[PDB]
Amino acid sequence: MRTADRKHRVIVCSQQSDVDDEGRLLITRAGVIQGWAAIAPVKAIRFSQDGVSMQKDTMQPTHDITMNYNPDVNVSVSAWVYEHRLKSPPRWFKVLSVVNVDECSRYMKIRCRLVETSDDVTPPV
Amino acid sequence: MRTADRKHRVIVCSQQSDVDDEGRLLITRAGVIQGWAAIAPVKAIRFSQDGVSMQKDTMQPTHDITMNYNPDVNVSVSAWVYEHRLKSPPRWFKVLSVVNVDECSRYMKIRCRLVETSDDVTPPV
Amino acid sequence: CNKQNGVKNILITFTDCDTQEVIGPISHEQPDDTLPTYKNCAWTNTALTNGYVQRSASNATMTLPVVRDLRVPLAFYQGCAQVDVQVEKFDGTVMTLTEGAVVEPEESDGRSVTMNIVASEIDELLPP
Amino acid sequence: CNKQNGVKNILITFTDCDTQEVIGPISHEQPDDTLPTYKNCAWTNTALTNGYVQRSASNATMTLPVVRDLRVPLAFYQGCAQVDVQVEKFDGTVMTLTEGAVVEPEESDGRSVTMNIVASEIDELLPP
Amino acid sequence: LTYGNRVTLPEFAKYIVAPAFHEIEGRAIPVTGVDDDASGTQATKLPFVLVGLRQGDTSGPATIAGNSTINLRDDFIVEFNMKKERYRDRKGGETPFFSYYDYESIRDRLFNSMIEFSGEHGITFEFVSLDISTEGDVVYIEFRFRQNYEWCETV
Amino acid sequence: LTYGNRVTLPEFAKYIVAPAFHEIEGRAIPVTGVDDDASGTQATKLPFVLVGLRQGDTSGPATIAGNSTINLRDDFIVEFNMKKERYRDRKGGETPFFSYYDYESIRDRLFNSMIEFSGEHGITFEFVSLDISTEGDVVYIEFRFRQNYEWCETV
Amino acid sequence: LTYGNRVTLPEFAKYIVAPAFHEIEGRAIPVTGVDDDASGTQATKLPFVLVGLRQGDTSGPATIAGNSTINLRDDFIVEFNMKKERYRDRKGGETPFFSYYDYESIRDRLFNSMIEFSGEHGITFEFVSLDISTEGDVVYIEFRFRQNYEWCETV
Amino acid sequence: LTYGNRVTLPEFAKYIVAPAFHEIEGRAIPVTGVDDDASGTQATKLPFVLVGLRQGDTSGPATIAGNSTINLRDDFIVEFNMKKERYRDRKGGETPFFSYYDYESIRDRLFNSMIEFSGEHGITFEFVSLDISTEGDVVYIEFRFRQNYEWCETV
Amino acid sequence: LTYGNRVTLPEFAKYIVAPAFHEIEGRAIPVTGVDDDASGTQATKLPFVLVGLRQGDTSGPATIAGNSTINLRDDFIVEFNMKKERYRDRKGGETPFFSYYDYESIRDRLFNSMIEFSGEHGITFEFVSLDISTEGDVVYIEFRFRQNYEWCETV
Amino acid sequence: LTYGNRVTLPEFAKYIVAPAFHEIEGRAIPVTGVDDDASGTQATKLPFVLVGLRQGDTSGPATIAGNSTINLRDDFIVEFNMKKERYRDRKGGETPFFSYYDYESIRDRLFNSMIEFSGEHGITFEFVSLDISTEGDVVYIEFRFRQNYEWCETV
């Protein structure tokens, strides 16, 4: 993939969770990586105004993310991708799996599932 | 795609619903966006005199509508597409999903379904 | 029409035959789908030969399962005080039984007793 | 609120009717889902004619299934020992029984017995 | 009301569900079947409680002979569609979409309105099952009721 | 009519359904199977009612020995094909295709015709189940009846 | 706690499982359904427990008539998400990921907590089934409890 | 005939089905299974009736000990293949292929022939079910019979 | 033979089927499962019997306590693979491959051999079901027998 | 040993299966599920035996109330993995892989080890079913056991 295809600014996030004292749980999403990436859709999306995607299986990836490989980072089962745009609301991607493209260790292919896309999401800290 | 292929004049409509005092419900369709789009069939259609389609699943899209991307509008689960022709009865489409073509944010591809096509549909307001 | 069969209200009134105290419980609740059962004719019949019959005097009986109310003692349900019961079905029928007496008490576990009440006569209301 | 029915505590005291040696009070465990059953005051009734009734003397009865305690002999359950029993349900009720006597012993297998205790009177607590 | 010993699905929706929750604006849409259309019954304001007959059957004697106390049993369901709302904290914390949703308030006051209706007209239904399931930002609360009655013919 | 203690599906259609609802222009079609051909049985105009044998069965003893009170049971289903008609309020609103459809009037008038026929000839059927489902703008209401009789032999 | 003769799933998690096993840092999560979203409920740190309603049901009589001793049954399941930890010797050996995992200590300490809570408040649960399954390096231990209660109405 | 207390398939087809309908020219073909081949069992010119065993089972005591009254039960089915004939009414009118087919005449005289055979030799069969189904211009009429007997060994 | 109150599958074969039908040249093969390998057990010449354990099970009490009359039940199936032979009647005619096949003689001779073995040794089997099916020119006749015995222990 | 009225899966494998057959060198591997992984549990040396819990259930009363004689039933299974060895009979002759395998010797001495252990500690198991199945050069001998006990809580 030509390096001009990477035209999205993403923030790869690892989530931490802690129980709320009143009885709930809270998921803190902090950024660990920020760079240029190229996204591509592999499925349509049901939006259900207020943004939350209405996918049923919650395990079929909808977007494929291509970015630069990094041998020391270990993209977990609990990684997120916060992609921010200029005049469109930000989007929260939840990773579903990674692909080491052709095992050349040049790019990672992160099968992700659109979580939602609205102007009232919590940016990462 | 070819901008000379967008040869269909459609009006994207939102669905507002409320129950009549008599006990039944009533749905109105308000026009929100008007522009040119390109439609194509991806499945055959059962007419059933009085025009209304006879698709059984009611979840497999039958037409794809491509039009100009618009970053401020959110095509929800409750969007319709009213297509008017010159010497052909008008049509009513119900959207099933949209996909941002190649995520380039230049065209929206509306995965939609034909509801009915008869000379006595209720035009938008 | 014949609106769906079933009980709606069951009122019970205990009066102890030793201290002459009275209790007006706040009506009881059916424990299951079985209904209170009734028999009004106070005269039983016996089959003689060739169509005849011996009409003798007898009682009016009533069978009522109810959940024990956790304020009135259980003894008051096992045939230990005079009871005044009133039932109301869904179709409008109301049957009242006054100054009855529980006969043949059967073992109960503490939450659902089955009363075998005997009385002189039960009146029926026959909804209009 | 009618807390869920069920038994919580069972206390039993054995006192041999020959040597007058006492054992207990010992706790005990229900063997299955069923509950102990009760009939409190000692005056049963019988159906006379025309609503009347003959009130005669009788006994307070009690039937309780329990798992045999592997330190008390089985004879103390089969009716060769006076028993004093106490039960407590979840809803707060307590039922105590003094100077009971196992009557009509039933053939058992050695780990689960259901005894028919008879006494002069059973006392209640009636959840305050 | 018609059917003095029964209540139609329109009557159920407007007299039991409507005097219930005021956040639904009487959107108890009477439908033929609960799954007759998932693309149509998903556009209304998110509450839009649905009511529809699942299957009609008998409850014992059902012969049609003019006088046999023809017994009938209608099995219908009521599907709640409630918008889930996440709890945000001002430290970068949030509650995921799979958090527990309190259906207890819903069943309680729905039963209460049903109790009041039974008291006012003498009509009772049977509760069978309660199922909950989510999808995106919507929670489906599905009760399954069953109503017994007798079909009174007309002369 | 033949089979004095019984009726055949053609007689059922022309004597119980035809003197019944008149908006069908007497279009009561007996078929082999109600789902044998859906491309041909979906061509008839708006008001057509179908009747077809689901399964032939027994009702207890069925041994064929010349004198054993040979008991029989035929399971057939009658399906109403009715067109849903939306309502318009002139303000620019409409009723969706998934709205409730009043089937009870259909069951009432169908059962009344059956009661009248039974009272006339002394032949009664058993009601089993009722299923309703829509597709496009047509609603399918499928009654499942069941009829017991004894098979008369001929010397 | 509300519902004096009952408990809700949040109270169950914070009163029976949280005072239970301490290697969970109080991560007792109530959800709608334990399998509604497997991509989100697999992100929390390794030792977390899930509690979710499987299906609401009855326990006999459930007719709602103002006085019928309305009996209810809520069927929920508790799933343990634990990390399997292989053992290593000093001669280049290892234990496979499919080796036996001691679940009995989990069931013991879980049941002890339930017994203590019942003895304190007089509320008991019924154990139905236990299922264990592994995936990767995480073992799933799913307890299926069932709770009976009577639904109290409010005037 | 062999098996004095039984009737083998060949004897059934030639003595009960053959003296039945004369439009069959005696084409009562005994097969192993009714569905052993659908491409070969559909080549016969003209209408044709098949006879084949579905499965053999027991009817209670079945031990093999020389004297235990070994009871056996053979479940076979009889498949009618009848050519449908549409009714033409010159006005440009016709009757579709999904029209009702009168199976009653078939079952009646088949039962009659079975009755006469039972009276002649004292052998009775049990009727179980009757299913009809069409395909193109052929209607399949399937009877399912069941025959009880005792297997008499030979010395 | 071992297990004086029982028989194993090799003994069963070599004592009941080999002294039975002689056109098999003693080709009665004991297999693990009759459907474990269809590519290997379809190679032996025309007339071959297979015998294979379907499932081992119990017949009531099966607790292992040293003295509990441990009851056992073995469900095994015996399958004949025989060649169907068409008949030719010089006129240029033939019989189809789906024609009826006489399984009754095979069943009779198998049961006679079993009765003889029982009367000799005091060991009986239970008959359960019989299924026949053809493929190509080979007919499959599968008898499903069942045998009860008590498991003797050794000190 | 812990659980004086029970045996854990590790104890079962090392005290009942290990003193059994010496051809497995004590390779009685306790697993979580017998089908948790077919790629990892097929690497051990051919003569190896697995033991894993299938599902835990109850045996009647199961309420958790501190004193209710909480009864439990753990359904576990033991899978034998034995290498099949063909018999060569020099003339160019061999025995195929679908030949019968003698599982009786396996069941007999396994039951004997279970009997000796029960006599030593007073713990008995229930036999439920035995199924065998082969694959290539390996035969799977699958027993399914069931053990009843009472869960004694700790003060």
Q: Please judge whether E56 and F97 are an interchain contact, meaning their C-beta atoms are less than 8 angstroms apart.
A: no
**Which DSSP letter does residue F68 get?**
S
**Nearest Cα to Cα of residue I79 among I40, I30, I116, I113:** I30
Q: How far apart are CA H31 and CA I132, in angstroms?
A: 11
* DSSP code string of H56-113: EE-SS--B-SSSS--EEEEEEEEEEEEE--PPPBTTTB---TTS----HHHHHHHHHH
List CB contacts of F102: < 8 A, sequence separation 6 or more: E8
Phi, psi angle pair for E117, to nearest 5°: -65, -40
Query: With an 8 Å Cβ cutoff, is J56 touching chain G?
Result: yes
Cα distance between residue F122 and residue F1, in whole Å: 13
Phi/psi of residue H116, each to 5°?
-65, -40
β-sheet bridge partners, residue B11: B34, B82
> Which of these, D54, D34, D2, lies nearest to C107 by C-alpha position?
D34
Q: What is the CA radius of gyration of chain I?
A: 18
Q: Give residues with Cβ within 8 angstroms of F54, minimum separation 6.
A: F33, F34, F75, F76, F77, F144
What DSSP assignment string belongs to G83-139? E----B-SSS-B--TTB----HHHHHHHHHHHHHHHHHH----EEEEEEEEEETTEE
Q: Which residues contact E44 (CB under 8 A, 6 or more apart)?
A: B15, B17, B25, B27, B78, E27, E29
DSSP string covering E130-142? EEEEEETTEEEEE
Q: Write out the H or E segment, with its range, that includes residue D122.
A: strand D122-123
Quick count: other Cβ atoms within 10 Å of Cβ B40? Answer: 10
Listing DSSP states for J49-104 in one string gives EEEEEEEEE-SS--B-SSSS--EEEEEEEEEEEEE--PPPBTTTB---TTB----H
**What is the SS3 assignment for A124?**
coil
| Residue B49: count of CB within 10 angstroms of its CB | 11
Q: Which residues contact E107 (CB under 8 A, 6 or more apart)?
A: E130, E143, G56
Residue showing tokens 């069953």: E146
Mutate to test the interface with E, among B14, B18, B19 (most CBs of E within 10 A): B19
Chain E's closest residue to B115, CA to CA, is E40
Q: Which chains touch G (3 or more CB pairs under 8 A)?
A: A, C, D, E, J
Q: Which of F88, E30, E40 is nearest to B125 (CA)?
A: F88
Neighbours of C7 (CB within 10 A): 20
Beta bridge partners, B110, equal: B65, B98
10 Å CB burial of residue A88 (0-12, 13-18, 19+) is middle
Cβ–Cβ below 8 Å for C32 and G63:
no
Which residue's structure tokens are 């427990």? G49
DSSP state of E9: H
Q: How open is the CA angle A102-A104-A108, to the nearest 5 degrees?
A: 70
Q: What is the 3-state secondary structure (H, E, C) of A5-49?
A: CCCEEEEEEEEEEEECCCCCEEEEEEEEEEEEEEEEECCCECCCC
Instruction: Give residues with Cβ within 8 angstroms of I151, minimum separation 6.
Output: I70, I71, I72, J111
Using alpha carbons, select from B57, B56, B62 the residue that is nearest to residue B91: B62
Q: Which amino acid is at F81?
A: N
CA-nearest of H58, J66, G111 to I125 is: H58
Report CA A100 to chain centroid distance, whole Å: 17
CA distances from B32 to A34, A47, A50, J146 (A): 37, 17, 17, 67
Task: Check: CB of residue G74 under 8 Å from CB of residue G125.
Answer: no
β-strand partners of C57:
C43
Q: Do chains F and J touch (3 or more CB pairs under 8 A)?
A: no
How far apart (Å, rounded) are the C-alpha atoms in residues I71 and I5? 12
Cβ-defined contact of B50 to F95 (cutoff 8 Å): no
E140 touches chain G (CB under 8 A): no
Residue G48: CB partners within 8 Å, gap ≥ 6? A17, G24, G27, G28, G29, G81
d(CA J40, CA J57) in angstroms, rounded, equals 28
Contact across the interface for H65 and I104, Cβ inside 8 Å:
no
| C-alpha dihedral sign at F111, F117, F119, F122 | negative
Q: Can you say whether residue E122 is alpha, beta or left, with left for phi > 0 and alpha for psi between -120 and 50 degrees?
A: left
Cα E56 from chain centre: 16
Nearest chain A residue to B105 by CA: give it: A88
Neighbours of D, requiring at least 3 CB pairs below 8 Å, are: C, G, J
Do F30 and F52 form a contact (C-beta atoms < 8 A)?
A: yes
Among the partner-chain residues A24, A27, A52, the one whose CB lies closest to the CB of E136 is A52
Q: Does B77 touch chain E (CB under 8 A)?
A: yes
Cβ atoms of J97 and J75 closer than 8 Å:
no
Partners for F (CB, 8 Å, 3+ pairs)? B, E, H
Q: Could you tell me if E19 lies within 8 Å of chain F, comparing CB atoms?
A: no
Strand partners of residue B30: B14
Helix (H) or strand (E) holding J118: helix J104-121
Q: A90 Cβ partners below 8 Å, 6+ apart? A: A82, A83, A84, A117, A119, A121, A123
- CA B12 vs. chain centroid, Å, equals 7
Give residues with Cβ within 8 angstroms of B6, minimum separation 6. Answer: B36, B37, B38, B66, B67
User: Nearest-CA residue of chain G relative to J29?
Assistant: G99
* G6: phi then psi, degrees, rounded to nearest 5: -165, 175
DSSP output for D10-72:
EEEEEEETTT--EEEEEE---SSS---EEE-SS--EEE-STT-EEE----EEEEEEEEPPTTS
Residues 71-100 of B with CB under 8 A from A: 71-72, 74-78, 96-100
Q: Which residues of G touch C10 (CB under 8 A)?
A: 67
Cβ proximity of I142 and I130 under 8 Å: yes
Nearest CA in chain E to F134: E36
Query: Phi/psi at D5 (nearest 5 deg)?
Result: -60, 155
Q: Name the helix (H) or strand (E) containing H128.
A: strand H126-135
**C67 and chain G in contact, CB less than 8 A:** yes
Does J139 lie at the interface with G, CB-CB under 8 angstroms? no
Q: How far apart are CA I35 and CA J98, in angstroms?
A: 10
What span, in angstroms and rounded, lies between the C-alpha atoms of J110 and J143?
A: 10
Cβ proximity of J30 and J49 under 8 Å: no
Residues 6+ apart with CB under 8 A from B38: B1, B5, B6, B7, B8, B65, B66, B67
Q: Where are the beta strands (DSSP E) in A20-123?
A: 25-41, 63-68, 79-83, 91-100, 107-117
Q: What are the chain F neighbours of B56 within 8 Å (beta carbons)?
A: 135
Secondary structure (3-state) at I128: strand
Nearest CA among D39, D31, D37, D118 for reference residue D79: D118
Residues 4-43, chain D, touching C (beta carbon < 8 A): 5, 35-41, 43
Chains C–D, number of C-beta pairs less than 8 Å apart: 85
Q: In sequence order, what are the residues at sequence separation of 6 or more whose Cβ sits closer than 8 angstroms to the Cβ of residue E14?
A: B23, E26, E28
Query: Which helix (H) or strand (E) covers residue F144, if one does?
Result: strand F138-150
Where would I find the beta strands (DSSP E) of chain E?
Answer: 29-31, 50-57, 71-83, 126-135, 138-150
Q: What's the DSSP call for residue E16?
A: I
Q: How far apart are CA B6 and CA B66, in angstroms?
A: 8
Whether the CB of G95 is below 8 Å from some CB of chain J: the reply is no
Nearest CA in chain I to H8: I104
Give the closest residue to J36 by CA, choosing from H101, G135, C107: G135
Q: Which of G49, I7, J153 is nearest to A19 (CA)?
A: G49
How many CB atoms within 10 Å of residue B95? 25
Contact E38, E44 (CB under 8 A): no
Rounded to 5°, angle at Cα A97 from A96 and A100: 155
Distances, alpha carbon F56 to alpha carbons C109, D103, H135, in Å: 51, 61, 19
Q: Please report, as a single letter, which amino acid is at residue H93.
A: G
Distance between CA E110 and CA E112 in Å, rounded? 5
Task: Kindly tell me the sign of the dihedral angle through the C-alpha atoms of J11, J13, J17, J23.
Answer: negative
SS3 content of chain B, % helix, strand, coil (to 5): 0, 50, 50
Which segments within B20-106 are labelled E, that is strand?
25-41, 63-68, 79-83, 91-100
CB-CB neighbors (< 8 A) of A17 in chain G: 27, 43-45, 48
> Do J127 and J114 meet the contact criterion of CB atoms below 8 Å apart?
no
Partner residues linked to E142 by β-bridges: E79, E131
Which of H108, H103, H57, H59 shows the shortest CA–CA distance to H81?
Answer: H103
**Chain I adjacent subunits, 3+ CB pairs under 8 A:** H, J
Interface test with C, best of G69, G150, G151 (most C CBs within 10 A): G69
Q: Name every chain G residue with its beta carbon within 8 A of the beta carbon of J56.
A: 129-131
